[PDB]
Amino acid sequence: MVDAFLGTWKLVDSKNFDDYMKSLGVGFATRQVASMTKPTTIIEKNGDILTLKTHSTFKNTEISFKLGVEFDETTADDRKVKSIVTLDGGKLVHLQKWDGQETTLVRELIDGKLILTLTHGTAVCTRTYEKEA
Numbered sequence: 001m002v003d004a005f006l007g008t009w010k011l012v013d014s015k016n017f018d019d020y021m022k023s024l025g026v027g028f029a030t031r032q033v034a035s036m037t038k039p040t041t042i043i044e045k046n047g048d049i050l051t052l053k054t055h056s057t058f059k060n061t062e063i064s065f066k067l068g069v070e071f072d073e074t075t076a077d078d079r080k081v082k083s084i085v086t087l088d089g090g091k092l093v094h095l096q097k098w099d100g101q102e103t104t105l106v107r108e109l110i111d112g113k114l115i116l117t118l119t120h121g122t123a124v125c126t127r128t129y130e131k132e133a
């Protein structure tokens with residue numbers, strides 16, 4: 001059910017990422033480098049387990065999870081969160097919870113592009129990834 005999300009994806013558009021990072025309390029120097037970074041996201045499955053890698057010249061992350069099962073995560077900005085990823089309306093919805101705060105990372109496919117929408121507080125960031133062969 002997750003299969004069209006699988007593969008290697010490269011960042012090709014970013015809107016409001018600084019707003020999102022600011023909302024999370026990321027410092028100006030980190031936001032500055034991040035605003036010029038173009039990550040590669042790799043999504044793989046092995047049975048029920050998904051692994052999502054995010055690689056860049058600045059920071060790298062990797063998570064593994066089962067859909068619908070909570071997991072601990074330490075984010076790129078060093079938040080220790082409780083996470084769950086589900087399919088909802090054909091979108092891959094990742095919810096992170098910490099200190100009573102929530103942020104969502106929603107992925108959807110539009111015309112073969114991967115659109116990642118990041119919401120925290122009032123900040124809404126939209127990042128577009130295109131598929132590597």
Ligand SMILES: CCCCCCCCCCCCCCCCCCC(=O)O
Binds near residue numbers: 026037056060
């Ligand atoms: C780890 C790969 C590099 C992520 C970009 C540069 C580093 C940002 C650090 C500070 C904000 C981190 C916010 C949470 C993760 C955003 C994930 C956004 C995406 O997958 O496109």
